[PDB]
Symmetry: C2
Subunit: 385 residues, 2 copies
């Protein structure tokens, strides 16, 4: 469970039995034909896979390139999170667990988890941070409609990190009945491998679709990176393929302003939620609060596989600011009629940061941005626009 020096199982000792039980159960389904049949049948009929590779003609003409969008926004619940939530709650039910817990910031992973819990008829308790938006109010009503319990997180600054903290305390105090569902590729082994292996269907589908459109592998593949599950899903089948893989972290107000979530670019090696990885820290090793106009990227850590990919040069990493992501949000809505998630808008914004004239670019559209409409229109950068 080590990606070079990163990863590991840096957890309280009482969690070692659950991690070893999870690792053994996951190793059993690796060859189980029945599991992958029930899972892939749900990905097709319940989630909507395979998602199409859409040629954005008007976006391509603006940049003088051939830009393709991997349409993960067309999935059920409207984000890639549904791919990981279905497979993990299914694994939980197969392991005999009767309760599901998870943490969420705005409510996206909470909705995807509560959706899979209602599909499999399991108890679901979601710990959610505080934000005064119609988006979160809708997610609360979604999760309550799906039958899940929502516990407003009051610890810390009531962020996604604080919600994950409360969900982990729930897991430890309910280890007999509860399965913990992480939202990204951040966590103790084998969680980063489990989440990535559930998301790599994105990159596998992409590898089969792009030669039908261009007769060759793409020149670039761009995806937004916070924890890194959607980027790892599309990057993994293309590792060491020669395709330029670019992960875009949240630059916030600026990489030198102290208000961002670029764990790889500005973080230090540390421990967060079970994994040794790059975390935003001060000089004394204390985790720092992240910031981003995108709630999905507002996380101070990054998956250990991305820290390994960055070190070995297999994936290139950069960041874009809040304003650049807001501009890409409006740009795709006007040019293609697709309202992208503010998370994926960071990857779309990077189309301006690379010389793509005449290049074939695939952008991972990780979700739709209807949840972000009020945040975008009320932002002072857009209001002044």
């Amino acid at each position: 469970g080590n990606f070079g020096p990163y990863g590991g199982q840096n957890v309280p000792e009482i969690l070692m039995g659950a991690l070893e039980e999870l690792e053994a159960a996951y190793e059993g389904i690796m060859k189980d034909e029945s599991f992958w049949k029930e899972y892939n049948d749900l990905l097709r009929d319940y989630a909507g896979r395979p998602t199409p590779l859409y040629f954005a003609r008007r976006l391509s003409e603006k940049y003088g390139a051939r830009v393709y969008l991997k349409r993960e926004d067309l999935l059920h619940t409207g984000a890639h999170k549904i791919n990981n939530a279905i497979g993990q709650v299914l694994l939980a039910k197969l392991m005999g667990k009767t309760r599901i817990t998870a943490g969420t910031g705005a409510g996206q992973h909470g909705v995807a988890t509560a959706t899979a819990a209602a599909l499999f008829g399991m108890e679901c308790v979601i710990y959610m941070g505080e934000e005064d938006t119609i988006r979160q109010k809708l997610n609360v009503e979604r999760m309550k409609l799906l039958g899940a319990k929502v516990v407003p997180v009051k610890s810390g600054s009531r962020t996604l990190k604080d919600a994950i903290d409360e969900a982990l305390r729930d897991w430890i105090t309910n280890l007999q009945t509860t399965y913990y569902v992480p939202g990204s590729v951040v966590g103790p082994h084998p969680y980063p491998i489990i989440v990535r292996n559930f998301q790599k269907v994105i990159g596998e589908e992409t590898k089969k679709q792009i030669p039908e459109k261009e007769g060759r592998l793409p020149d670039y593949i761009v995806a937004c990176v916070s924890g890194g599950s959607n980027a790892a899903g599309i990057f993994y089948p293309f590792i060491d393929s020669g395709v330029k893989l670019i992960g875009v972290e949240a630059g916030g107000e600026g990489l030198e302003t102290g208000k961002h979530a670029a764990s790889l670019l500005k973080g230090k090696i540390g421990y967060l939620h079970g994994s040794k990885t790059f975390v935003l820290q001060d000089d004394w090793g204390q985790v720092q609060a992240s910031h981003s106009v995108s709630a999905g990227l507002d996380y101070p850590g990054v998956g250990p596989e991305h820290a390994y990919w960055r070190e070995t040069g297999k994936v290139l990493y950069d960041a874009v600011t809040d304003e650049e992501a807001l501009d890409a949000f409006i740009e795709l809505s006007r040019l293609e009629g697709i309202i992208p998630a503010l998370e994926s808008s960071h990857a779309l914004a990077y189309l301006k940061k690379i010389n793509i004239k005449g290049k074939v670019v695939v952008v991972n559209l990780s979700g739709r941005g209807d949840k972000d409409l009020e945040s975008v229109l009320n932002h002072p950068y857009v209001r002044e626009r």
Copy 2:
């Protein structure tokens, strides 16, 4: 363009010119395979077609049936309306039009139209009636469409369509009018149905690979009738029990509903001879429904013909019953259905389906209806 005695072009004389040029342009693409190739490529890559046919295991176990759901909620914009909007604006591009106009009530059809207009890079002007509406207005503005609030009449979907047709009449040189359903003057009912029949043609090729036989029932909600006619047309005279469900509102015998085929009378609405809710003096009556998508006093002429010749059966369910189906599918399957499609799901309690294979048309997702369902007095009590 007559479905027996229904249909026609009952319009003012000024509209006859654009309707003849629109019919003429539509006959040209009837055999043009380059048109339908571009249309189907967009349906696949842009809208997300083909949509899956999902076996609802927990829902099937509740009634003893094998209930399947045609997942139109997984389309772009989250409703079947996108199938029609993409095809009409594609037709607008071939005709040389550069402006798109349409009418909408809560804004569901306005978003689908503004989405297709942005995809083709065209000007879009939407006429709309009075959080779901606020969000839809923000969508249409983010998509680049001009939203004109409707002030005439009761400011409903019917009044918005009137202003949109008024807009089309004034600018019939550069503007293509996009209807939302299979209601309107010829050739619009056939154009919309021919764009929506991809649903039934997909369902016809999917249910064999899942049951070996043809389905026993195919249920779908009906207002104007675009999503129902889309899934019904490839199954007409096939033996399958085709059932359309209209909006019963507060009750069929309450005067607060939208069941045009059940409680309406023959008449004219927006250019089509069909069944319209009206009083004993021929004046059109206002419709009511907990779902804004079904809040329309008319029905498509092809549905009036199907009901008369017995090729499709029609019924209606109450607001309270649609709210139960809304909560039921969310709790049982984790799929929040549209309050429109919830009328079809509620019909699973009104027929014997024990051992029968049923296909319900999930016309759209119901995240737009979350605030309306929870703040309703019937749901607030429970």
